[PDB]
Paper text:
The nucleotide and substrate-free, inward-facing conformation of [name] IFasisolatedapo, obtained in as isolated conditions, exhibits canonical features of type IV ABC transporters. The successful determination of the IFasisolatedapo conformation was followed by a screen for substrate molecules binding to [name]. Next, we analyzed the dynamics of heme placed near the lateral entry site of [name] in the IFasisolatedapo state. Analysis of nonbonded interaction energies between heme and IFasisolatedapo shows that electrostatic interactions between K3D, K7D, K314D and R192D and the heme propionates play a key role in attracting heme toward the lateral entry site.
The ABC transporter [name] plays a central role in the biogenesis of membrane-integrated and soluble cytochromes. Here, we used cellular, biochemical, structural and computational methods to characterize the structure and function of the heterodimeric bacterial ABC transporter [name]. We provide multi-level evidence that [name] is a heme transporter required for functional maturation of cytochrome bd, a pharmaceutically relevant drug target. Each subunit is composed of a membrane domain formed by six transmembrane α-helices (TMH), an N-terminal cytoplasmic elbow helix oriented parallel to the membrane plane and a cytoplasmic NBD.
Residue numbers in the entry:
A (entry chain C): 1 to 352, 356 to 573
B (entry chain D): 2 to 588
The structure:
């Protein structure tokens, strides 16, 4: 439970809303027990008094206790469910901010896109499980413990031995039964997560490879193996229902043991009285009622294992070391920037390596050519400072790139990534992301000037766009990435692969889009195409991580060379 | 829609016919449990009266205690017994539904499956079918116990005192009257707040999947404030919904508090000589008041649990929403006749104006006319918007056609797939290895092949030249989605799988598509030689090496608009010449 400490410290912010929602749970449970305990005594005392004791018996105080106990029993439960859920959402927001504020310095490579991005569904699910800790674990367990102690202390004023055995049975099952059932059903819970993921693997390998399995005549043999896993999976599921069935029967026998013990022991003597009379019902009805506080307590402990497991994943995922550090110097963004590389790798090393060592002037459009299969360029990762370069040094305007703070580095460089993202927000917010201070007119002009005239439809900027709403096509989505880079207005622009997967009618249209609108900027492009390299200068041909040829298109093409071979033939 | 909601639970209640014995024992054991509750409240009330009013020592009450202990053991037995019987109910429907989902998902075959991602089908079979368990295991048996048990208390209390049985029964219509009266708000708050809560639920994951884009624009610090804003709005919008849904829950808690208070004060006053009414012209006893007071909380206990189990109906109808459509979508199927080829020699495909129909109904290929004599190697090349791969599926048997596609003179609509596919072996992009070990993946074609003939396929496919790098060699395990082997190293096993048989037709659906620079050469080296032995039909986007292939067909929106060898067709200046230009321009 050490791994759960960093998230319990998030509860300090709302220690009043969280604690009040527990106090209302105890008051509701104390009124639940008090209503049936007072009622049991009131029926006994009235019957013992009889009609002859109508005037002697004070029946207006107990009859006002049942009114008060029946009002806080129903009003307290309404407010408990209300305050608990309010505070559950106020720590969900705190949990959401806490993890997002710690996954930002780790954003490019700290996550590393592990498990084929099945990672981020398991982070929303694990954050939603640390949310359950207060309402599914802490509230049922803390509430039950101090309900037991109050009735144990309360009944002590009448009889010490009776109060201790009733509370002792209730305390003993609060501390013994939940751990014993979590320990008894831990082998099955392990054998059920393993068999669930084994069936999921055998199913995905059976649906993905249905074409292969059918033609090779084995689609009915792997169905039998798939069906045999489900039989073993349903047995693990069945055996965790026999413990739940056995834990619900034992809770009923323990609550039966308390009622019978009070009947047998409280009839002997109550508080040193040979003839307890109406007192006998005060104890057997406080034992009938007090075991509803123990109803949620075994399931609460069962969930604490799930919460602890999620806390470990969130603590290891966001408890890493950032790959880069940004010094804070409050530098001034340059109006014109000249990117200077010096012996820096272009892709990852392979097959077991001098750098590019290029130079880009203040406003030169430069393109970098590379073969498709050799590797994926890490120039934009290193230029946006996703990770520090192992060798060489990047200079932005004759100053090392590490000296720029995060605020100013993001403003000198505006990239159009290959994988461009549609935020689930209005089209205004997908554009206002780049320049947060633009007006509705400026956004309208850019949307027209990039060729996104369709998006400026009757619905307009306010139209929802993203996962929930509209989905954009690759060519239309590519123009959205350029729209952000035009609004961001950085002196340097990096283009990962501006035309990949686009047909020639829109592949061209993008090229004069970049040329006509990024004419004053220091654009540096990376492509595996030779369509629009004519409008650029100092085309760089990369071969095995080395510059083999460099120069403008006409000069580079005029002489026989590698770029000449690319133009005609494979 | 309520009409859909009504007919969704009609589907749910008609899926319960399988294992109706388990849902009848649960309903029977809910009647037995409602009697043992009355039995123990009568024994406890008669013991309590004896030792409070008649001052009988506990040792003289050893018979009622023995019975009282017995009805606690029995009542704890049926709780253990009807939790197990209830589970066996949920387990049978799920097993039978899952069997006819996989069955329906196998008749449709590869053509329909590839329409959705693999994880989309796993949700339908893993997550969406386990969501109907709590409906049948807990919720459905509870509606039996919520109507059986409360009526038993009213029936049991009525002989003792009809005023105590009228307090409990009086609230029987009042609870649904007020639950539905406040249910207008819960159906109103979930109308105004449904859209926003749909957008807000899923906002955190959206911002979390775009941290790379937020980083490059310096908006990380300004999206923490957007998460703060989108969570304050989520909390107060989803509490306006809950604040009305806790009035419905609190109504039942109000009427159980009122009934316990009215039972206590009616009996307490009547014992005292005030408020004399309700009994059957006989003095009300203490054992009458105790029985009513013990059974008053248990009259509403069945109804309270039904409230907690109601979420199980919410998810099991959502699961039924996505499962009822799945089992009712009309699906095309190949006619799968009973003809069989009688020649091992390569087949001769002839096609006369056939449309290839997707299972959903739409056509994928227009009017196709072509002819492949025996041993010929065709090749289909297009702009990726041509649906050329649909022709390969139709030849494989995964698609339905409304023309003529007779193979070797026999109409393919009449071939038995189980015997036609024995002459078929094929390779394609995104190769799938379903078997466990790398040796078994290759032997998936035929497990009776001799190990010497196995070495021929493991050698000709250039897969034995990276086996030593693997830990165990031929017997190394192949992980999830062939994780141990790279995509280049995976396809060379698939090629080795195809080469293990003397097939009559070979179908290459873009092999060496996303392979590396070297593995593509090894696949193409082995798979060009293999294509010569038997008639083939290959889909490509690599136009460089098609010089030696017999005939080339180009597709534009599903028609063969050019034919002929590469040499004379390259210089013709048609769409292929422009098609080859796009290939050569992109290094």
């Amino acid at each position: 439970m050490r791994a759960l400490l960093p998230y319990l410290a998030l509860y300090k912010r709302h220690k009043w809303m969280l604690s009040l929602g527990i106090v209302l749970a105890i008051v509701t449970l104390l009124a639940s027990i008090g209503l049936l305990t007072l009622s049991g005594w009131f029926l006994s005392a009235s019957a013992v008094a009889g009609v002859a004791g109508l005037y002697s018996f004070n029946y207006m105080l107990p009859a006002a206790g049942v009114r008060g106990a029946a009002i806080t029993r129903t009003a307290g439960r309404y407010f408990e469910r209300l305050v608990s859920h309010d505070a559950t959402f106020r720590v969900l927001q705190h949990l959401r901010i806490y993890t997002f504020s710690k996954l930002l310095p780790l954003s490019p490579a700290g996550l590393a896109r592990y498990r084929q991005g099945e990672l981020l569904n398991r982070v929303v699910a694990d954050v939603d499980t640390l949310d359950h800790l207060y309402l599914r674990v802490i509230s049922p367990l803390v509430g039950a413990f101090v309900v037991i102690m109050v009735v144990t202390i309360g009944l002590s004023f009448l009889d010490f031995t009776l109060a201790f055995t009733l509370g002792g049975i209730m305390l003993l099952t609060l501390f013994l039964m939940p751990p014993l059932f979590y320990r008894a059903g831990k082998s099955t819970g392990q054998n059920l997560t393993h068999l669930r993921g084994q069936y999921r693997q055998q199913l995905t390998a059976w649906l993905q490879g249905q074409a292969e399995l059918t033609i090779f005549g084995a689609s009915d043999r792997y169905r039998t193996q798939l069906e045999n896993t489900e039989i073993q999976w349903l047995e693990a599921q069945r055996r965790q229902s026999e413990l739940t069935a056995l834990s619900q029967a034992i809770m009923l026998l323990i609550g039966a043991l308390a009622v019978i013990l009070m009947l047998w022991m409280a009839s002997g003597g109550v508080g040193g009285n040979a003839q307890p009379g109406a007192l006998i019902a005060l104890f057997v009805f406080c034992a009938l009622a007090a075991f509803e506080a123990l109803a949620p307590v075994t399931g609460a402990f069962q969930h604490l294992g799930q919460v602890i497991a999620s806390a470990v994943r969130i603590s290891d995922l966001t408890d890493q070391k950032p790959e880069v550090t940004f010094p804070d110097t409050q530098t001034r963004v340059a109006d014109r920037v000249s990117l200077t590389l010096r012996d820096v790798q272009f892709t990852y090393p392979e097959q077991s390596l001098k750098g590019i060592s290029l130079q880009v002037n203040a406003g030169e459009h430069i393109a970098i050519l590379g073969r498709t299969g050799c590797g994926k360029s890490t120039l934009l990762q290193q230029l946006t400072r996703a990770w520090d370069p192992q060798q060489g040094e990047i200079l932005l305007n004759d100053s090392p790139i590490a000296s720029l703070n995060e605020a100013a580095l993001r403003q000198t460089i505006s990239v159009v990534p290959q994988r461009v993202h549609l935020f689930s927000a209005t089209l205004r917010d997908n554009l206002l992301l780049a320049s947060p201070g633009s007006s509705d007119e400026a956004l309208s002009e850019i949307l027209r000037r990039v060729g996104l005239e369709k998006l400026l439809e009757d619905a307009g900027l306010n139209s929802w766009l993203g996962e929930g709403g509209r989905q954009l096509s690759g060519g239309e989505l590519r123009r959205l990435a350029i729209a952000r880079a035009l609004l961001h207005d950085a002196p340097l622009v990096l283009l990962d692969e501006p035309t990949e997967g686009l047909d020639a009618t829109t592949e061209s249209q993008i090229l004069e889009l970049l040329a006509e609108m990024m004419r004053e900027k220091t654009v540096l492009m990376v492509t595996h195409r030779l369509r629009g390299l004519s409008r650029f200068q100092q085309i760089i041909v990369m071969d095995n991580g080395q510059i083999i040829e460099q120069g403008t298109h006409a000069e580079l093409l005029a002489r026989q060379g590698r770029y000449y071979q690319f133009k005609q033939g494979l | 829609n309520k009409s859909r909601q009504k007919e969704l639970t009609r589907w749910l209640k008609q899926q319960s016919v399988i294992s109706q014995r388990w849902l009848n024992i649960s309903r029977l054991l809910g009647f037995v449990s409602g009697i043992l509750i009355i039995a123990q409240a009568w024994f406890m009330a008669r013991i309590l009266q004896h030792m409070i009013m008649e001052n009988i020592p506990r040792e003289a009450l050893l018979l009622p205690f023995t019975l009282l202990v017995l009805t606690f053991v029995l009542r704890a037995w049926v709780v253990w017994l009807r939790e197990r019987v209830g589970y066996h109910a949920g387990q049978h429907i799920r097993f039978a539904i899952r069997r006819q989902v996989l069955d329906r998902l196998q008749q449709a075959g590869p053509a329909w499956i590839q329409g959705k991602p693999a994880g989309s089908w796993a949700t339908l079979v893993l997550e969406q079918i386990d969501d109907m368990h709590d409906y049948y295991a807990r919720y459905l048996p509870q509606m039996a116990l919520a109507v059986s048990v409360p009526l038993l208390i009213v029936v049991a209390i009525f002989p003792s005192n009809w005023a105590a049985a009228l307090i409990l029964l009086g609230t029987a219509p009042l609870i649904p009257l007020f639950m539905a009266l406040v249910g207008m708000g819960a159906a109103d708050a979930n109308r105004r707040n449904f859209l926003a809560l749909a957008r807000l639920s899923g906002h955190f994951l959206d911002r979390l999947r775009g941290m790379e884009t937020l980083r490059i624009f310096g908006r990380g610090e300004a999206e923490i404030e957007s998460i703060r804003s989108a969570s304050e709005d989520f909390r107060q919008r989803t509490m306006e919904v809950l604040r009305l849904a806790f009035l419905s829950s609190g109504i039942l808690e109000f009427f159980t508090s009122l009934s316990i208070a009215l039972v206590a004060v009616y009996f307490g006053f009547s014992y005292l000589g005030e408020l004399d009414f309700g009994h059957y012209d006989t003095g009300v006893t203490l054992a009458a008041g105790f029985l009513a007071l013990i059974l008053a909380p248990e009259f509403f206990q069945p109804l309270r649990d039904l409230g907690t189990f109601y979420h199980a109906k919410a998810q099991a109808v959502g699961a039924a929403d996505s499962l009822k459509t799945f089992m009712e979508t009309p699906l095309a199927h190949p006619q799968r006749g009973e003809a069989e080829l009688a020649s091992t020699d390569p087949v001769t495909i002839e096609a006369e104006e056939l449309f290839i129909t997707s299972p959903e109904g739409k056509t994928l290929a227009g009017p196709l006319n072509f002819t492949l004599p025996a041993g010929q190697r065709a090749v289909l090349v297009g702009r990726s918007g041509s649906g050329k791969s649909s022709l390969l599926n139709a030849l494989s048997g995964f698609l339905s056609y409304q023309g003529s596609l007779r193979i070797n003179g026999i109409e393919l609509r009449d071939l038995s797939p189980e015997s036609w596919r024995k002459h078929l072996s094929w390779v394609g992009q995104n190769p799938q290895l379903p078997a466990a070990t790398l040796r078994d993946n290759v032997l998936l074609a035929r497990p009776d092949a001799s190990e010497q003939e196995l070495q021929a396929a493991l050698d000709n496919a250039w897969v034995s030249e990276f086996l030593p790098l693997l830990p165990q060699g031929v017997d190394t395990p192949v992980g999830d989605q062939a994780a141990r082997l790279s995509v280049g190293q995976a396809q060379r096993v698939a090629v080795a799988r195809a080469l293990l048989n003397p097939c009559s037709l070979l179908l290459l659906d873009e092999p060496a598509a996303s392979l590396d620079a070297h593995s593509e050469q090894r696949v193409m080296e082995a798979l060009n030689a293999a294509s010569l032995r038997q008639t083939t039909l290959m889909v490509t986007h690599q136009l460089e090496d098609l010089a030696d292939w017999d005939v080339i067909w180009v597709m534009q929106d599903g028609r063969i608009i050019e034919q002929g060898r590469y040499a004379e067709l390259s210089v013709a200046g048609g769409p292929f010449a422009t098609l080859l230009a796009h290939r050569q321009e992109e290094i």
